[PDB]
Write a structure and sequence with these properties.
By secondary structure, the chain is α/β, with parallel strands linked by helices. Helix content is 36%, strand content 13%. The protein has six helices and five strands; from the N terminus they run ββαβαβαβααα. The protein has a five-stranded mixed sheet, with helices on both faces. β1 and β2 form a beta hairpin. The longest helix has 13 residues. It is globular and about 45 Å long. The termini are far apart. The chain binds chloride ion (3 copies).
């Protein structure tokens, strides 16, 4: 066979730094939680429901064993809610000045949440840049276009 699944050689799935103290990504494996700690990450905020087929059996244990704080905010991909975004904003406020990873499976939910947080915080994130993991899919997901629109409606820049 030829070289297979080269992405497994390329680190954390869908990793994208969003700010000096904020990472967004897809799903870190167990080893990568140790790497995250070594890179200075203090808090892992997980938006992927534990019922998902890709979920770790006990991510909180992996995170806490690696020396970090764990926050679990399960966001239903097929039913995002404003209250999910508010829970995320609340978790961020409880960890001010700390290095945070927000993640899901492939960095759709996490990049969107990171975007809305930076918007609310007055950081004027570039949406096209922040939400790179979405490529041109947002319009294909009306529930997500709705969420982004409603939360954005509350703020300026
Ligand atoms: Cl790795
Ligand atoms: Cl859907
Ligand atoms: Cl940006």
């Amino acid at each position: 066979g030829n070289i297979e699944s080269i992405e497994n050689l390329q680190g954390i799935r869908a990793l994208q730094q969003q700010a000096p103290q904020l990472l967004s990504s897809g799903l870190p494996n167990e080893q990568q939680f140790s790497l995250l700690k070594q890179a200075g990450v203090d808090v892992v905020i997980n938006l992927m429901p534990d019922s998902s087929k890709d979920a770790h059996p006990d991510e909180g244990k992996l995170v806490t064993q690696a020396g970090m704080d764990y926050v679990y905010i399960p966001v239903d991909w097929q039913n995002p809610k404003v209250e999910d975004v508010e829970a995320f904003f609340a978790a961020m406020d409880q960890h001010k000045g700390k290095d945070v990873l927000v993640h899901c499976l492939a960095n759709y939910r996490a990049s969107a949440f990171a975007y809305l947080y930076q918007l609310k915080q007055g950081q004027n994130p570039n949406m096209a840049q922040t939400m790179t993991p979405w490529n041109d899919e947002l319009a294909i997901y009306p529930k997500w276009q709705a969420l982004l629109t409603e939360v954005s409606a509350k703020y300026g820049h």
